[PDB]
Amino acid sequence: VNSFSGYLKLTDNVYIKNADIVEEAKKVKPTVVVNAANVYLKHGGGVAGALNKATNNAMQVESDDYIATNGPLKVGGSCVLSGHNLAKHCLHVVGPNVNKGEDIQLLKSAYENFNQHEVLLAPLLSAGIFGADPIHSLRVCVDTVRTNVYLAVFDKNLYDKLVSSFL
């Protein structure tokens, strides 16, 4: 038993809810919140901009130190950093950005990072300003992630479409 509320169950291990991941994170304090990061951990907009804003820019400060030490992530890769006031940990995962021409096949590799964590609150990778089809992203999520994932979908219209077209 865990503290996530109001989710619709899609499969044995995947759940979904129309929710703001920031507000969801502040209420649940999950062990892991997933950030839709880029390789530079520059959290300017979308989910990342919103998560970083909610941390009063502490996420960005920590991220800049991480990059200065380690260099950029790979597309499809991830790193674990602090969750600040939102979660114990933040798993920064880089899905491909279609608006940069990145290979959509790397989306499966991106979701594989979730399997290193028993439970996660997360957005749909490569959705929103990353330019992928969220229905495709949901399909890859369900077919790749084996751990328990609680997907927060900000847009109500998109949430209803995801539920209604889901196979």
Ligand SMILES: O=C(Nc1ccc(C(=O)NCc2c(C(=O)O)[nH]c3ccccc23)cc1)NC1CC1
């Ligand atoms: O500003 C906010 N929240 C807040 C702001 C923006 C977002 C957001 O861009 N979402 C779309 C998105 C999804 C998805 O929804 O599937 N996946 C993505 C992957 C990469 C980039 C974007 C997305 C989400 C939340 N809260 C303030 C009031 C306290």
